Ligand binder design. Structure first.
Ligand SMILES: *Sc1ccc(O)cc1
Length: 67
């Protein structure tokens, strides 16, 4: 399937979008989940599971569609 393909891509839309969206309130917590998402993948290599990151991020990415 992908697993990582979903992690490598989302990381681009995750930050780039928020960095270009510039907002507050809803964006305040939105970034909190972002900084943690980028640090997990870039750092994780053997542990943490790749399927666990693509599933969780699914919530963040979907949130970008609105913002
Ligand atoms: S990951 C990320 C990047 C930029 C923001 O403004 C927020 C989250």
């Amino acid at each position: 399937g992908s697993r990582v393909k979903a992690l490598e891509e989302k990381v681009k839309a995750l930050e780039e979008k928020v960095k270009a969206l510039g907002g507050g309130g809803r964006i305040e917590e939105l970034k909190k989940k972002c900084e943690e998402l980028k640090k997990k993948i870039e750092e994780l290599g053997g542990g943490g599971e790749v399927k666990k990151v693509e599933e969780e991020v699914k919530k963040l990415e979907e949130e970008i569609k609105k913002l």
